Amino acid sequence: IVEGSDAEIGMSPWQVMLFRKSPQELLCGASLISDRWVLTAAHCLLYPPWDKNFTENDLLVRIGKHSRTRYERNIEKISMLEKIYIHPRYNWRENLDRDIALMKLKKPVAFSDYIHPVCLPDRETAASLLQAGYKGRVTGWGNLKEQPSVLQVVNLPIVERPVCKDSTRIRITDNMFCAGYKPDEGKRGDACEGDSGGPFVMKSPFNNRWYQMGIVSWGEGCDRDGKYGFYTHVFRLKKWIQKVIDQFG
């Protein structure tokens, strides 16, 4: 995260770290959506231009974390993957369309003050919250500019789709939205390398619950003036998520 701030303890108890087994290192961000399912970006798992193709056994899930590098004894929990499910129409070849994956845990994780699932939006929450100017929150342990001691947080406004489209040469789809400040806005901030797969969340003013509206997906550079970060539109791929869980739950 660029130009963010240190998270408060328990501020993002759905935050997950995707952790490589050898060599031991941060792969990606992710989020907890129930006691056995974790949501992330497909590109965290499969990205042939970079020779990335992980299988269950290559990785661990670390939940409840705050510090990036420390083993947080008595707080974090470390989980093994039973199964990875990647969107069957994920487009890694051109624009990262449908950049989404689910991970099923071998065993359920115990909830705690530091470990708790985020909600996924229904259609009316999506309709109400996904509006230009409305701010969400992105969290991660990624690069501080184009590494932090602890989890970082930044609040960013959703940007209007024509602006999103005009800021890039990439073909933008309905399954993405972009967020970030304009040069004329003063404020700045962005996701960056390492934050991939982490959640963009919003707090519903109707029922005061946090909802994950986006997944950190791509950006040309990090916190560049005139450029925006792009997020997978979780509500738009809801059917697929429901299908996977309802079948393999």
Partner: peptide, 27 residues
């Protein structure tokens, strides 16, 4: 059931330092 309600914040009626920035943008 309980999704999206944080033990150290909503469950205790405590607010984090910047969530009100989000609320204020929901115009």
């Amino acid at each position: 059931a309980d999704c999206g309600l944080r033990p150290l914040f909503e469950k205790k009626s405590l607010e984090d330092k910047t969530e009100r920035e989000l609320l204020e943008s929901y115009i």
